[PDB]
Amino acid sequence: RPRFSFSIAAREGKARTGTIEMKRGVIRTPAFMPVGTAATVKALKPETVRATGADIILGNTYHLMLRPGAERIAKLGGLHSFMGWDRPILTDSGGFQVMSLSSLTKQSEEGVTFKSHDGSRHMLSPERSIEIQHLLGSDIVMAFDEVTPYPATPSRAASSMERSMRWAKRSRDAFDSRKEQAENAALFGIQQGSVFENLRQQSADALAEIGFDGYAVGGLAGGEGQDEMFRVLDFSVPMLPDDKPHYLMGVGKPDDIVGAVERGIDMFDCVLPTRSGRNGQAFTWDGPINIRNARFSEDLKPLDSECHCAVCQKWSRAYIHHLIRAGEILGAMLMTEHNIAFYQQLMQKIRDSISEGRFSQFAQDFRARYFA
Amino acid sequence: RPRFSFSIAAREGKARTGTIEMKRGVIRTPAFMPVGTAATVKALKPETVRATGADIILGNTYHLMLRPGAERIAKLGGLHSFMGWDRPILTDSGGFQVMSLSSLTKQSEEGVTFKSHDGSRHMLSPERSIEIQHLLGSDIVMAFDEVTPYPATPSRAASSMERSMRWAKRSRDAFDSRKEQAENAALFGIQQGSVFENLRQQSADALAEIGFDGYAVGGLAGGEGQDEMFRVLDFSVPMLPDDKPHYLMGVGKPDDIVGAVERGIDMFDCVLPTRSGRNGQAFTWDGPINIRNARFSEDLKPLDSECHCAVCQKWSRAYIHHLIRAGEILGAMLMTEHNIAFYQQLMQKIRDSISEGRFSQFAQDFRARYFA
Ligand SMILES: [Zn+2]
Ligand SMILES: [Zn+2]
């Protein structure tokens, strides 16, 4: 396999299905990436993550740089070796969690300094973020950008997008200057601009001029609501280069994924299925359920009637109800495995339906049942 | 397979190795039984418990009767079906945890009434305990006894042992009157008498007159220290019928197990490897380690150099150190799997060494290294 190659096998409207080939493996798109925080997908061995159908996982740079430390992970042989996942890993830049979780935050054109949420002092910059992602041994490296809050005024969205594009060029140059990283990993840029079409366009043009292996739509899933998110995707995704993957960062709920694929998105991540699995929320084709509800206490059916996962093969709603109510670790294990398996089955249905030219019908059928 | 048959294949001094055959499976002795509290061996799927080598698990009646409830479990098809473990299960009587965890405790010759640790009111008696164990679908049912605290005066140890023997007869009669239980499960009696040889003898004689499928040594591992425990086993175990299994309740540390087998014990349980696994304590042939210690932060070796478990095949001390320090669920999963696998490897070495007439040498070699 090559360092990076994205092939599109089939299309339907704006939707695409295909493959990303990388040295560590093939990624089927559209793809869902389970989130590994601190070098673990919560409550799952890597073999179980793979058994659910995942081709790639996401690792959080911020958490890793705090515990166990990026230099330490590099000394120990890299993130893949450390956690026992040998397939591709996409790392985020660390910037988002600096803003959402850290304490200091002195921001500047150079980057950000901050206090860990033991109050030790740390720094991130385009250069240091790219370096940390190298030390982790990331396969897909995210450019370091500045968070644009929602809502944002046009002036502030513009200023922040402009800074992010300067940081995208610095990220590109840092990545390219490190021969081992340039030859073995891929680099994605992040489109900014809040909800403003003109700023989204300027951002896409700047990122395409620099040139990346893939393009994320940043700044969404931050409070805006689905209608607004879809409205922004409607004009934003077509601005990105068609022949590279489009990654919607932090999305999301099953219905958000379906609509985003309808709008040209190829890659997804979110904590939702893992975090909400822990935590009683289980996804089903008839919509989510909360397994803690008393109505499930004697329900012998599996979490979902059709799901092919090992949890649905082997245990009842009644048992999982009991485990989650009792605070048992096995409850978190089982809920997380089922929810990430459900997400992968959703992605497989999306891929097959695009391949077969019946994705619009699938989306309609999916929604009719999920919201019945 | 029969309802119950204990065969002794080989002996060395007081030590024995053999098999218990029951309808749901064969148990190799000496046996270690991982403890399932509330219908789960903490942080492990039943398939993983089996992969470590366990032939039988213990279920805690007290916890089960509170959550999810014994009648509910029976409605749902029994404990085996509910939790997904199809091999034998030994249930305790519930009495111990009434004393250690519950709030009310009004004790009488009839039994005990108590408040749950939501303050709902419950009762246990020989008859109700046997009934609850039936409703759970237990394969090995423990007679309901009275807890003798350590230390105990001779008068109080005698009074309590005498009550326990009256309750042993009531347990026997309750079990025998329920045809389905009598035909499919086994019943063990519990020897009492604190540290007093004469009381231990009276207790053994009373239990043998009633007649049980197996005999537990109760009332130890309660604060007495290893020398005293071994001193009591020295005279107590030979009092029990030789041709039935001898079960030392609540023991214990690897060295306690080796010495107890030297003294004629065939069956063991304890929370130690699971609870202490969570929790940073890992067993090794060179003695226990605490994986949280900073000295392990960059240690690429497995938990134990010889252990054949999947954790030692796949992950380093450094990774598990990180997970436990970070409070990650996967840390509990990995530590628990390794510790229960270590216990099963200990039992296998004990069985093979007795079978080969070299158990005394094994015990000496084991101690020399474990305490080096
Ligand atoms: Zn499932
Ligand atoms: Zn091991």
Residue numbers in the entry:
A (entry chain A), B (entry chain A): 11 to 127, 129 to 383
Copy the relevant paper text.
Transfer RNA–guanine transglycosylase (Tgt, EC 2.4.2.29) catalyses the exchange of a specific guanine base in tRNA molecules by a substituted 7-deazaguanine. Bacterial Tgt functions as a homodimer in which the protomer consists of a (βα)8 barrel harbouring a Zn2+ binding subdomain close to the C-terminus. The reaction follows a ping-pong mechanism including a covalent Tgt⋅tRNA intermediate. Hence, in an attempt to generate a model system for the active site of human Tgt and to gain insights into the relevance of particular amino acids for substrate base selectivity, we adapted the Z. mobilis Tgt active site by site-directed mutagenesis in order to mimic that of the human enzyme.
In order to investigate the importance of Gly232 and Val161 in human Tgt for queuine recognition, we created a doubly mutated variant of the Z. mobilis enzyme in which the corresponding Val233 and Cys158 were exchanged by glycine and valine, respectively. To allow the interpretation of the obtained data at a structural level, we determined the crystal structures of the mutated Tgt variants created in this study in their apo-forms as well as in complex with preQ1 and queuine. The crystal structures of Tgt(Cys158Val) and Tgt(Cys158Val/Val233Gly), each in complex with preQ1, reveal, compared to the corresponding apo-forms, a shift of Val158 towards the ligand. In contrast, this side chain is excellently defined in the electron density maps of apo- and preQ1-bound Tgt(Cys158Val) and Tgt(Cys158Val/Val233Gly).
